[PDB]
Design a protein around this nucleic acid. Structure first.
Lengths: 299, 43, 235, 50, 235
RNA sequence: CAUAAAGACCAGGC
């Protein structure tokens, strides 16, 4: 935050869609980086869960200006929040105030030549620490169309490459999330149709022997541009009903089975939490079960 | 014992900055009233 | 020898009371006219790039695959945990590389004091808070790897393959191997038997903790002894 | 108010203090205006890509 | 050692072609970014007051009793002759004090080449014209006395009694013991195997002749080696 | 070694 304040650095984060604001005050039970679960006591006060309002914090996605919007939590374990209290940070916010740049030791002097018109000089320490290392996200989008011979498939069978290019690709052409790619590694598994025309008649004759799809392809895969070298943080899945999504693909079949089962378990924890807490104050009015109620599960 | 906030310049704010998105939220919300009735704009 | 009276019967009373591995009040007496600023600036010239050190190179985490995932049972994210691991200072006596063992489950703020003590690894800051842990079997484990270097080389030209053979889950981290952090010098006067206009150059030295200040100033002292044999030979 | 609150402020008086050169070293003539300026880094658009 | 590639496989090609005792073109290569001005200014800082020398202290003349008399057979006065003896540079190898023998009669401009050669005294400027002599038995004789000092101490606090016991005819003269006169440095670039942005710091050194430049820069080099052991010890 | 069209419009740097 700036060492000089004005009175407007705290209102931009709260008033805009920057700092997460709770809908109704409650008791915080757990805190994660991707979600902040809030146990709001809509019933009698118990550590058994309640009318859960889960809050999805947008973590690492792409904006228009090739940057990232971050939301880091600040509420610790066991802190009763108020309607209007801050819950997570913004892309530059410290707690609730706006903090764009930094505060460094400045010294006004013509150093030697370098600061001629509008140049800024700084020591070796500024790159030894990640004090100005920002996150730059670039989208590599490519739109799907059709072909004269007939449109496509999915496989990782890409000729004219090495082993390290197909090593970070799975059996289905999509690179993993979190792979150390660089200039040269294949992100996108495209190959290009030669057709009957580009082949010589000698391989028309031995492509009366090999296959309809045996030598129909040549390499023009979409790679990393020359000079940039980062990591993969987000992949995309877009498919259209007609033409038979691949299997084996064992890791795509495993992946959102594993993720989707957790997506069921968290949502049944939330709605189970929101209804069984609701009927507890209904059932206590007219009876009591001290030893019998905490043995059977919450469903 | 009560004192002054003691900052640069004696201009005490009595009414803070309002909702900065009132250019957007009031014009669109009054324009197309999803939860309210039909009035002001499309209507 | 004893010679004439310039500086030869003028001993340098430079003595020691040690603070462990991170800061030292360095005293000096006596040196004659105009001998403070060239001292501070020449050993600011040497002690920023000529000093090797052992810093953090590449860190492996558990089932969290890259820097921007989440872990079930932690409040902060893995990027802030690794940011807390960048500032961790570590001393290695005579090993090229070492792997630090760390494991802790249950509730409790894990600090740098939970690291398993090695015979050549000593932690200078046990009070460094890394992250806050919660209930529901929050088991975290890391493998801190220490390598030798000198000064700042970026993480795009060094690129290392420890676990970049078929099991993956490592990525290269920026390394600041430079031990010496801050040296500030005071320039009051001193007096000894020979002459009066003699400067007392009292130094506030600050080191991160990778290399001890005694060994660093002895290495920089014999490097300085290697320096000024330059004016010697002919041609 | 500034000249009243800067004759106070540790360390210097009236803003300026004798520094030392990082290259020469010596007693620096004309104490200079120093401090902690809140600067700001601009973004890296794809224009800055080589 | 060999280490990493910063400066360790970078030899300093600093070589010698000597001009006798008064000026030397000092060459240097290679040193990296921003290493010319701190060199010239730090050894302008050392080489003006930290260097001992042997200059003119107190001169005895013949029957001319003080500085403002006249001598039968000379054109100029004794004050201009002693002014010419102030600028005379003399080298003394290992003697504390030495008396120089000088005598010449008849017509002829007496220069510094008429001084009787001693085994430890070498004249750098034999072409220095002192005064013009005439006929009519113009016999002049002087006893040049050389003492060791350093830098400028005035002639009112030192005051010496060589012949201020009962036979008189001496008075104390201002002494500039400082050998180093001028150092000018050029800051063109150099290139060697490791890196390209390396500065060639070529020096035009000028010395009066009291102390040789090789011995002076070796003494200032080991004084510099005595300087930067300042950051060493604790407390 | 060959492929990522052309054009429109907008935003941006000075």
């Amino acid at each position: 935050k700036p060492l000089v304040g004005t009175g407007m650095e705290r209102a931009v984060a709260v008033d805009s869609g920057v700092t997460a604001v709770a809908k109704r005050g409650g008791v915080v039970q757990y805190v994660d980086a991707s979600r902040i679960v809030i146990k709001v006591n809509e019933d009698e006060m118990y550590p058994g869960e309640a009318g859960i309002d889960i809050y999805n914090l947008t973590k690492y996605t792409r904006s228009n200006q090739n940057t990232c919007i971050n939301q880091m939590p600040c509420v610790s374990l066991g802190e009763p929040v108020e309607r209007g209290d801050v819950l997570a940070d913004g892309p530059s916010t410290d707690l609730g105030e706006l903090a764009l740049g930094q505060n460094m030791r400045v010294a006004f002097m013509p150093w030697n030549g370098y600061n001629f018109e509008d140049s800024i000089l700084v020591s070796e320490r500024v790159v030894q620490e990640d004090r100005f290392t920002t996150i730059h996200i670039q989208e590599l989008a490519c739109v799907s169309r059709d072909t004269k011979l007939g449109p496509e498939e999915i496989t990782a069978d890409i000729p004219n490459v090495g082993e390290a290019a197909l090593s970070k690709l799975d059996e289905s052409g999509i690179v993993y999330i979190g792979a150390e790619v660089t200039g040269g590694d294949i992100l996108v598994g495209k190959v290009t149709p030669k057709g009957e025309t580009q082949l010589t008649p000698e391989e028309k004759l031995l492509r009366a022997i090999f296959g309809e799809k045996a030598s129909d392809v040549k390499d023009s895969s979409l790679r990393v541009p020359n000079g940039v070298s980062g990591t993969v943080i987000d992949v995309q899945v877009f498919t259209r009903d007609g033409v038979e999504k691949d299997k084996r693909a064992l890791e795509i079949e495993e992946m959102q089975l594993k993720q989707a089962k957790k997506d069921l378990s968290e949502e049944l924890q939330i709605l189970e939490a929101g209804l069984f807490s609701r009927i507890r104050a209904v059932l206590v009015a007219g009876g009591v079960e001290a030893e019998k109620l905490d043995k059977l599960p919450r469903d | 014992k009560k004192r002054i906030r003691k900052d640069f310049g004696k201009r005490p704010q009595v009414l803070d900055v309002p909702y900065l998105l009132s250019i957007q939220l009031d014009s669109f919300q009054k324009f197309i009233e999803q939860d309210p009735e039909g009035q002001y704009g499309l209507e | 020898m004893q010679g004439s009276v310039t500086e030869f019967l003028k001993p340098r009373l430079v003595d020691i009371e040690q603070v462990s591995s991170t800061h030292a009040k360095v005293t000096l007496e006596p040196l004659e006219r105009g001998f403070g600023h060239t001292l501070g600036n020449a050993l600011r010239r040497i002690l920023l790039s000529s000093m090797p050190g052992c810093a953090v190179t590449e860190v492996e985490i558990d089932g969290v695959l890259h820097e921007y995932s989440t872990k079930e049972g932690v409040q902060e994210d893995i990027l802030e945990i690794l940011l807390n691991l960048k500032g961790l200072a570590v001393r290695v006596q005579g090993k090229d590389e070492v792997i630090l063992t760390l494991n802790k489950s249950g509730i409790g703020p894990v600090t740098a004091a939970d690291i398993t003590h090695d015979g050549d690894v000593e932690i200078v800051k046990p009070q460094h808070v890394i992250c806050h842990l919660t209930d529901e079997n929050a088991s975290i484990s890391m493998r801190i790897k220490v390598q030798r270097g000198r000064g700042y080389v970026p993480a795009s030209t060094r690129i290392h393959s420890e676990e970049d053979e078929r099991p993956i889950g490592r990525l290269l981290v920026d390394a600041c191997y430079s031990p010496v952090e801050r040296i500030a010098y005071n320039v009051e006067a001193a007096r000894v038997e020979q002459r009066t206009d003699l400067d007392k150059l009292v130094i506030e030295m600050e080191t991160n903790g990778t290399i001890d200040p005694e060994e660093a100033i002895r290495r920089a002292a014999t490097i300085l002894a290697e320096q000024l044999e330059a004016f010697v030979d002919l041609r | 108010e500034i000249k009243e609150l800067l004759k106070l402020g540790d360390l210097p008086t009236s803003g300026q203090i004798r520094l030392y050169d990082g290259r020469t070293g010596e007693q620096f003539e004309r104490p200079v205006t120093v401090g902690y300026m809140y600067m700001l880094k601009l973004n890296h658009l794809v224009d800055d890509k080589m």
